[PDB]
């Protein structure tokens, strides 16, 4: 963001990030696990706080 | 005595569920049965045996007031 042209960004996109790897090693989709929610608490006592 | 004049405590950590969240029964006759087994064999020594003279007082008592009105 700034004074930047977009096709500028672009070009220099190409020069110094094309040899990263598109698709991997075997390429398994990123597994995502949800996570749920739990109604708890937690208590730290201290009295000279 | 209100609750936030009581005491001094430090550096005790206390973890809790909501009662939403877990069963009302867990474990009653997996661990309630050996539970109160042990609870009974740590107090068996102490509460019966004065309850047992009671009793051999008691039927020495009704049998001897019978062996006096008898001929």
């Given at each position: 963001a700034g004074g930047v042209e977009h096709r500028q960004l672009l070009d220099l996109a190409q020069k110094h990030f094309s040899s990263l790897s598109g698709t991997?090693?075997?390429?398994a989709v990123p597994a995502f696990t949800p996570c749920r929610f739990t109604g708890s608490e937690i208590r730290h006592r201290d009295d000279a706080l | 005595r209100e609750f936030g004049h009581l005491?001094?405590?430090?550096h005790v950590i206390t973890y809790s569920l909501s009662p939403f969240?877990?069963?009302a029964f867990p474990h009653?006759?997996?661990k309630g049965i050996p539970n109160v087994?042990?609870?009974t064999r740590a107090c068996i020594l102490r509460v019966a045996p004065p309850f047992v003279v009671f009793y051999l007082v008691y039927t020495w008592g009704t049998q001897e007031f019978e062996?006096?009105?008898?001929?």
């Open positions: 991997y090693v075997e390429d | 005491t001094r405590m430090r969240e877990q069963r009653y006759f997996t087994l042990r609870r062996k006096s009105k008898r001929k």
